[PDB]
Amino acid sequence: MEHVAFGSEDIENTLAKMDDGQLDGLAFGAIQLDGDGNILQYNAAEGDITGRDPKQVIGKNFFKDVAPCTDSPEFYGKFKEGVASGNLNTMFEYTFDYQMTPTKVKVHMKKALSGDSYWVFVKRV
Ligand X SMILES: *C(=O)/C=C/c1ccc(O)cc1
The footprint of ligand X (CB under 6 A) covers 31, 46, 50, 52, 66-70, 96-98
Q: What CA–CA distance (Å, rounded) separates 79 from 120?
A: 10
Comparing CB distances to ligand X, the nearer of 52 and 110 is 52
Minimum distance, C-beta of residue 108 to ligand X, in the bound complex (Å): 13
Minimum distance, C-beta of residue 57 to ligand X, in the bound complex (Å): 7
Please name the residues in contact with 85: beta carbons below 8 A apart, sequence gap of 6 or more: none
Residue sitting closest to ligand X (CB): 69
Dihedral sign for Cα 5, 9, 12, 15, please: negative
Neighbour count for residue 14 (Cβ, 10 Å): 15
Comparing CB distances to ligand X, the nearer of 56 and 89 is 56
